[PDB]
Design a protein around this ligand. Sequence first.
Ligand SMILES: *[C@@H]1O[C@H](CO)[C@@H](O)[C@H](O)[C@H]1NC(C)=O
Ligand SMILES: *[C@@H]1O[C@H](CO)[C@@H](O)[C@H](O)[C@H]1NC(C)=O
Ligand SMILES: *[C@@H]1O[C@H](CO)[C@@H](O)[C@H](O)[C@H]1NC(C)=O
Lengths: 35, 35, 49
Amino acid sequence: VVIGIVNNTVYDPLQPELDSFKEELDKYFKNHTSP
Amino acid sequence: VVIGIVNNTVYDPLQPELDSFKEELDKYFKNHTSP
Amino acid sequence: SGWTFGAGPALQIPFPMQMAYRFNGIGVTQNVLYENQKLIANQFNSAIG
Ligand SMILES: *[C@@H]1O[C@H](CO)[C@@H](O)[C@H](O)[C@H]1NC(C)=O
Ligand SMILES: *[C@@H]1O[C@H](CO)[C@@H](O)[C@H](O)[C@H]1NC(C)=O
Ligand SMILES: *[C@@H]1O[C@H](CO)[C@@H](O)[C@H](O)[C@H]1NC(C)=O
C-alpha cells in the first residue's frame, strides 16, 4: 500500500542473539547423534 | 576516548533470560547420551 | 547545578555531564559529546575568544 518501498533484508538482532547458543546447540546435537 | 569512564559489570538482561534456559538445556543432553 | 536551581532546591552535577544532557534535547545522542569532548572544548574556548 505504501509507495516507494524498497526490497532489502532486516538484520533481526535477536535472531543472532539466540543463534549464539543455537550454533553450539547444533554442535551438541551433532555430538549427540554421532555415536 | 572518554574521560572518567568507570569499570563495572553490565547485567545484559537477554543473556540470563537465555541462560535461565541455557543452564537446563546442556544438562538434559548429557543424561540422554549416558545410555 | 543547571536547570534545577530554578525549579527547586539547587542540586549539583558535573559540567561535562550537563552538556551531554543538553544535546539530548536537540536530538543528537549524548555519546557524540564524550567522543568529541576535548575537541569541542577547544572550539568553545576559541569561540569565546
Ligand atoms: C520485492 O521482492 C518481492 C519478492 O522478493 C518481489 O515479488 C517484488 O516484485 C519486489 N519488488 C521490487 C520493487 O523489487
Ligand atoms: C576531578 O578534579 C580533581 C581536582 O580538580 C582531580 O584531581 C581529579 O582527577 C578529577 N577527577 C577525574 C576523574 O579526572
Ligand atoms: C578496567 O578493567 C580492565 C581489564 O580488567 C583494565 O585493563 C583497566 O585498567 C580497568 N580500568 C579501570 C579504570 O579500572
